């Protein structure tokens, strides 16, 4: 029943250029639990925390990778996810709208 | 609080 | 309510490291309050919110003792399951266990549960009568048979009826100022132009608790769900949650659409439009 991860990259608060915020990458619905989740800043991996492995009532695992960040007009943020179900890394770019 | 003991399969 | 106390545990075999990893997390309703990671330096049960930290040393020593016993036991179960199924020695496999209790109207157990899964598939689960098991396959019946002779269900049932609810009542009090107040969502309607016949409205609900919420779009009073995009509810990172619902509105029809937000933190359902 191996299944692909869903991915959302978003901020804790509505983002404004130059103001401290929090960058989240919420990865859920996947199985097996082995997975690689990286927050990227201009294509480069950031220092970020990862929540403890957990799952929902349908057995699907979920994880939160998060770090503080101050968005601006230039820096590109994205989240890169590697899973056995995925032929190649899944990459979702962040924006203040979604 | 977790349960007291956990069973073998 | 009903409020709930629940635990989620994941055991993963690591034949390439000679051992396995056991992770357990505890929740009161949608709030994780403890965790255990067998990979951690000095593996112990650790607090995950302020209110649980008022538990004395024996609490933490005992929870750690029990969860380590759970870890060692499930390491063995993984080895058994590999035999039971005749799987490869090099493969990594996953054992998930989930269990919890809900608080009834008169402070007694509501719907306790206990269910385990192997590699994502149902293995064995405690039945609704709390006295019998459902085994999903041949291997699970072997386990089921042992547990029947040993009345393992009585242990689980007495835990769910006694300690589980009792602890739940205790936790709800310790974190009352946090667990028993619903935090209403901060809501917004934003607009984002697309193409000629493309103009997206997005209704946001931010920083809310509990997790349960209802976001819908209407057009002059007509449900647009079949047209809208609704993302999975997601954690804010501070113990609250977020969600949004968006749809494409025709060029010039913004004001015919309304977003409706329903959450227990709210006195009444909120009607939002593109102000």
Author numbering:
A (entry chain B): 1 to 98
B (entry chain C): 1 to 9
C (entry chain A): 1 to 275
The authors write:
SLA-I molecules can present viral peptide epitopes to swine CD8+ T cells and induce the CTL response to kill the infected cells.
SLA-1*1502 in complex with NSP9-TMP9 was crystallized in the P212121 space group with a high resolution of 2.20 Å. NSP9-TMP9 is located in the peptide-binding groove (PBG) formed by the α1 and α2 domains. The NSP9-TMP9 peptide is fixed by 15 hydrogen bonds with residues in the N- and C-termini of the PBG, and no hydrogen bonds were observed in the middle portion (P3–P7). The A pocket of pSLA-1*1502, composed of Leu5, Tyr7, Phe33, Tyr59, Glu63, Tyr159, Leu163, Ser167, and Tyr171, fixes P1-Thr via hydrogen bonds and strong van der Waals forces (VDWs). The F pocket of pSLA-1*1502 consists of Asn77, Ala80, Leu81, Tyr84, Leu95, Asp116, Tyr123, Ile124 Thr143, and Lys146 and shows numerous interactions with P9-Tyr, reflecting a key anchoring site.
